[PDB]
Amino acid sequence: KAKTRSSRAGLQFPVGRVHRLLRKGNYSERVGAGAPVYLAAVLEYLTAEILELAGNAARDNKKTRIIPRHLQLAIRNDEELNKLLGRVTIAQGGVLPNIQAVLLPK
Amino acid sequence: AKTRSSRAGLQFPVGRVHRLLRKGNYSERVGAGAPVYLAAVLEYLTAEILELAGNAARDNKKTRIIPRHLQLAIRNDEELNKLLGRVTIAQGGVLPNIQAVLLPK
Amino acid sequence: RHRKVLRDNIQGITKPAIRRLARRGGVKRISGLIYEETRGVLKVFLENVIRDAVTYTEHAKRKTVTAMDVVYALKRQGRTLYGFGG
Amino acid sequence: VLRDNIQGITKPAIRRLARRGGVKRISGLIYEETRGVLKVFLENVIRDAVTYTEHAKRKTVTAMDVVYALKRQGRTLYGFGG
Amino acid sequence: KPHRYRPGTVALREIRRYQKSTELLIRKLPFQRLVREIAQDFKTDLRFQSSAVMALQEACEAYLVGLFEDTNLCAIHAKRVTIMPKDIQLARRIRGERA
Amino acid sequence: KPHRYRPGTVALREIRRYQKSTELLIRKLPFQRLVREIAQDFKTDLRFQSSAVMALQEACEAYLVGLFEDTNLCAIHAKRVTIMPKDIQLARRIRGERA
Amino acid sequence: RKRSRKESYSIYVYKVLKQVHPDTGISSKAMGIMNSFVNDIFERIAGEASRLAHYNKRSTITSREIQTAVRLLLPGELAKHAVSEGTKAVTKYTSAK
Amino acid sequence: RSRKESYSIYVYKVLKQVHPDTGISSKAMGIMNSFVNDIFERIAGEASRLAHYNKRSTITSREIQTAVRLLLPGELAKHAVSEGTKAVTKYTSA
DNA sequence: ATCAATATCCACCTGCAGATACTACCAAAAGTGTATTTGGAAACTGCTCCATCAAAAGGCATGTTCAGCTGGATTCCAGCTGAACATGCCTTTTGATGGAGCAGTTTCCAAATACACTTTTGGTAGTATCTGCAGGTGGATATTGAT
DNA sequence: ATCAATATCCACCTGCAGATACTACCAAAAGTGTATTTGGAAACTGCTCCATCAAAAGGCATGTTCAGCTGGAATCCAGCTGAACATGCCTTTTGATGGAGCAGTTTCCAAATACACTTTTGGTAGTATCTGCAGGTGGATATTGAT
Ligand SMILES: [Mn+2]
Ligand SMILES: [Mn+2]
Ligand SMILES: [Mn+2]
Ligand SMILES: [Mn+2]
Ligand SMILES: [Mn+2]
Ligand SMILES: [Mn+2]
Ligand SMILES: [Mn+2]
Ligand SMILES: [Mn+2]
Ligand SMILES: [Mn+2]
Ligand SMILES: [Mn+2]
Ligand SMILES: [Mn+2]
Ligand SMILES: [Mn+2]
Ligand SMILES: [Mn+2]
Ligand SMILES: [Mn+2]
């Protein structure tokens, strides 16, 4: 019986779809078999990383459902995700609470 | 045998531009007019820069264009400066420019 | 029939709206001349994105600007936007 | 003498760079500040350049390695290929 | 006898309020008219997906908020608490939006 | 009395001199020493094409000159003519290179 | 007439969410953000891999191109963990069949 | 050995059209080469995205044209589109 | 105003590094011609969703008054930073000299593509029922500002 | 400090939009197996150019002195801009409806690819002559700064 390439790789993200998107995307003449596996794993990993931190932000705000606000808090409060997505706008994400010290009353 | 470039009235290599498009993995297929159009655009933009650069050379009492002249031509031209806003020209230097508040008296 | 003429809608970007945006940006005090300056800056930004978006629309031979038209336009200008079909 | 390499980037050289940048007057703390910024710039570009070198299985950093590195850092450079 | 908060107290209260929330701060219908007016001047007889207008408003407000942040830093740099046109202009220059 | 130009006069002279020319302003060998040192931290036993180091110095000097321009505008914004660390820091922040 | 299929990473994003936060849900707008994110990073990596192949006159994008692209694109710790996950997934995939 | 292609002899040709009595140093020629390669990549890349966005497998002169409009500022774009259309019209009539 | 110390400019000259013009060689590239194939325009049209209308109402914009405190102007002076100059350290030069290793060539096989066939699945559609939390209320706690 | 006005907090609640659940259905996706092709690793080698070395030479960095003038601290005050209020407009909300035009399906040929074959060309390598301009000169005069 047939096992999927994802299961064979131990991945949740779809290896077959990633391979298809690579071939259709005009990135190169040929695509090695290991390329969609490696790529699917990285995407799956980065997703887990964001969801972990987003779920924590939801929890901090006494919520059980992640909304864009939680995704924004997770990304901007994490230095490496902030860097990776530094030129990205999260719709309905808002901004981090931040008041310049000199603006506070004495 | 007559070249596609001469056929299109161009100095820039149509055939080479076509080969470069095919091998660049830009798309599955390349239309016939595409490398002709692109070659013409590249030739025009080249002419525009050389014109202004040559003028910069003449203004500096020179007959040979050097990097400095290319920089002068581009930075002194609003649209070229915008097109190449994130580009560094080696040995180009900068435009003479002093903030007024720094001048004496 | 055709719609009423559209004009002077930049003034629909009101002073309290601009104040609100500045507050989210962490601004505490605002000069009176800021409001006209912001409108001019906003118009330039909008014009540039809309120009690119409509260009995508025209190339697809559509008469309707899509969310993707806008998303693509924002992307090529370095304002990548998530949440509308990226 | 035993001096760090970044300290080889001298005060007069930094002064000259500032002059071309149109700067008339310079604070004494600028020079150390500039060296730190310079080092970060080089670290970021060279890291990428060497990554290209390694991938090509080479031991020699080529100008194209550097040019490619500069482009993806958004510092496109004309005059050295590509 | 009537109660008055000092100048700046409410402004600070407003900063905390709006930095906590994510809702759009420009009125929906007037923004849509601006979009249609600008687009019309580029090309007549255009129609808009409603999500296209919303995508434009999300991007526009994010841009302006980000710009006011940099503008604020420029004002503070000059030992001011009040943002002025020249603060915006310096911010956009360094950004390379008018360099 | 012997001859002395006022402070600022020679500075302005140097500005005109170096904005006129295109030669690299950092000494070659010390820059080369710095490059090799940094690269050794990523990968040992490397060699460089001569043009590779030159590409790096052209890029690095163009970057610093551009940065000093923005830095200068920040100083002038605060009504100074002397550039300071906080000027460079503000410029880099608004550029998006930091913070 | 039938509306043609619109593919997304939703069911896969959802699976991963349940792994890291079993009792946590996600709104459709947030899922829209996540799908944009995956598409974005896909293109960034695939794009860098494409250039890298071309620079070295190779017609094939292998896991080695992907790995180098990951190192060029991702910041320190993210790159480290991504690479190990990618390497592990590949060696496991090949050790099968 | 091998051969290294560049745009040098074509750039030089164009130089003689616009400035018959003007030369160009090798370093300056290297910069022109970088310029041509850069703009090629930008235009081809945008044209590639355009085709992909519209689910087409072919890059035609129409994709090059829209790409030019997107990439070049006002007047440069106008003249570039004109020159491009001219060369395609002329190439067709031959 | 004068007047002296330098900086800066212009005209001219000459050595040479780098540009040129020449012949010749050749692989790769570009053209030409034929056979085959297929992407996508055209036609037709289903059906999503865009423009537009109405109508009620309250959230929010507008315009005003008032004065707190901010920005801008002035003054002052401590000291930092520019200018000048004396040393001498080390970058620069250049020219030769191994040899690292880039790069070109040949070999050949694991891994790619191509294809036919079969099974699996994620997307959509149709309804039908949970459920997290927005938003409203009330009342206790906290913050601000006058005194 | 006390106390009062007002914002802020949190617990509690309920309506419902939106998340969830399930069955049906199916085209596309994905996997399995077989045949055929080939990209690029591997080993070897030639020759490019990189590292190093010596060896002056002087250019340029560095340390020091002195004071001009800049940055920043302190003081004052006119009037900008924030806070609060009254008023009522126009955005928001809800819902309905025609039909523009986006998008699905099928047809079909102009233009794409794919080879084979022939011709042209750009890159090249020596080989030799040529020349634009850097760099040095003298001397005129412009600039700067002290009187
Ligand atoms: Mn109009
Ligand atoms: Mn077809
Ligand atoms: Mn009113
Ligand atoms: Mn008063
Ligand atoms: Mn003040
Ligand atoms: Mn060897
Ligand atoms: Mn299923
Ligand atoms: Mn609530
Ligand atoms: Mn082969
Ligand atoms: Mn003193
Ligand atoms: Mn001062
Ligand atoms: Mn119709
Ligand atoms: Mn020839
Ligand atoms: Mn000279």
Numbering used by the authors:
A (entry chain C): 13 to 118
B (entry chain G): 14 to 118
C (entry chain F): 17 to 102
D (entry chain B): 21 to 102
E (entry chain E), F (entry chain A): 37 to 135
G (entry chain D): 29 to 125
H (entry chain H): 31 to 124
Text taken from the publication that reported this structure:
The nucleosome core particle (NCP) is formed by wrapping the histone octamer, comprising two copies of the four core histones H2A, H2B, H3 and H4, with the superhelices of a 145–147 bp DNA duplex. The core regions of the four core histones adopt histone folds, which mainly contribute to the formation of the histone octamer structure. In contrast, the N-terminal tails of the core histones, which are rich in positively-charged lysine and arginine residues, protrude through the DNA superhelices. Furthermore, the N-terminal tail of H4 is crucial for the compact folding into chromatin fibers.
In addition, although the crystal structures of unmodified NCPs are known, we prepared the unmodified NCP by a similar method, and crystallized it in order to compare the structures between the H4-tetra-acetylated and unmodified NCPs in detail, under controlled experimental conditions for sample preparation and crystallization. We overexpressed the unmodified H4 protein in E. coli, and used it for the subsequent crystal structure analysis. The crystal structures of the H4-tetra-acetylated and unmodified NCPs were refined at 2.4 Å  and 2.2 Å resolutions, respectively, by molecular replacement as described in the Materials and Methods. Overall, the two NCP structures were nearly identical, as demonstrated by superimposition. In the unmodified NCP, these features are almost completely the same: residues S1–K20 are disordered, and residues V21–I26 are visible in the molecule-B H4. As for the other H4 molecule (molecule F), residues S1–A15 and S1–K16 are disordered and residues K16ac–I26 and R17–I26 are visible in the H4-tetra-acetylated and unmodified NCPs, respectively. In particular, the position of R23 in molecule F and its hydrogen bonds to E56 of H2A and E110 of H2B, in the acidic patch of the neighboring NCP, are conserved between the H4-tetra-acetylated and unmodified NCPs.
